[PDB]
RNA sequence: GGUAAGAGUCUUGGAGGUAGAGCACUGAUUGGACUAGGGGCCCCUACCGGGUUACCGAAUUCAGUCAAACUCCGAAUGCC
């Protein structure tokens, strides 16, 4: 219920959206125009921590 | 006591909105064009807008209804 609202209302364009491959997990979005490689790594670790 | 006014009928002139009719007002309404505005869905909304709505209906309009506290009208009888 938070995820559909976050994906369709909150985040604008060119926001990197992250999810675990073929495993259910939290939906993680970075609200910046350009994501730094370190930012992508950190958000991927957060998405992996909040996963199965 | 006044006295012959009283009453009925023919003729004439009036006031007063009932029966009936009608939307010319006040409401309630049914259908079609007309669509102010609101409803989902795609481009997009971090937000302005666009499309389709076999989607509702405040306006307005062609029609169709209704009304003791609606009347543009309007009797028969009663009344003076």
Curated annotation (Swiss-Prot):
It comes from the Bacteria. Induction: Up-regulated under secretion stress conditions, possibly in a CssR/CssS-dependent manner. Disruption phenotype: Not essential in rich media; synthetic growth defects are seen in double rqcH-ssrA mutants, further exacerbated by translational inhibitors spectinomycin and erythromycin or at elevated temperatures. Decreased accumulation of a stalled reporter protein. Double rqcH-rqcP deletion strains grow normally in rich media. Triple rqcH-clpP-ssrA mutants cannot be generated. No change in sensitivity to erythromycin; double mutSB-rqcH and triple mutSB-rqcH-ssrA deletion strains are hypersensitive to erythromycin. Loss of Ala tailing. Key component of the ribosome quality control system (RQC), a ribosome-associated complex that mediates the extraction of incompletely synthesized nascent chains from stalled ribosomes and their subsequent degradation. RqcH recruits Ala-charged tRNA, and with RqcP directs the elongation of stalled nascent chains on 50S ribosomal subunits, leading to non-templated C-terminal alanine extensions (Ala tail). The Ala tail promotes nascent chain degradation. RqcH, RqcP and charged tRNA(Ala) are necessary and sufficient to add an Ala tail to a model stalled nascent peptide; does not add Val. Activity of this protein is best tested in a clpP or ssrA deletion mutant; ssrA (tmRNA) encodes the SsrA tag added to nascent proteins in stalled ribosomes by trans-translation, which targets the nascent protein for degradation. Associates with isolated or stalled 50S ribosomal subunits. Binds to RqcP. Interacts with ribosomal protein uL11. Displaced from the 50S subunit by thiostrepton. In crystallized 50S subunits RqcH is variously associated with A/P-site tRNA, P-site tRNA and RqcP, an E-site tRNA or A- and P-site tRNAs and RqcP2(YlmH). Has 4 domains; N-terminal NFACT-N, central helix-hairpin-helix (HhH), 2 coiled coil domains with a beta-hairpin in the middle (CC-M), and C-terminal NFACT-R. The NFACT-N domain contacts 23S rRNA, the A/P-site tRNA anticodon and recognizes tRNA(Ala), while the M beta hairpin binds protein uL11 near the base of the bL12 stalk. Belongs to the NEMF family. This is Rqc2 homolog RqcH. The gene is rqcH.
């Amino acid at each position: 219920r938070q995820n559909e609202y976050l994906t369709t209302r909150v985040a604008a364009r060119d926001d990197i959206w992250l999810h675990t491959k073929d495993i259910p997990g939290s939906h993680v979005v970075i609200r910046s125009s350009e994501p730094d490689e370190q930012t992508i790594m950190e958000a991927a670790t957060i998405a992996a921590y909040f996963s199965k």
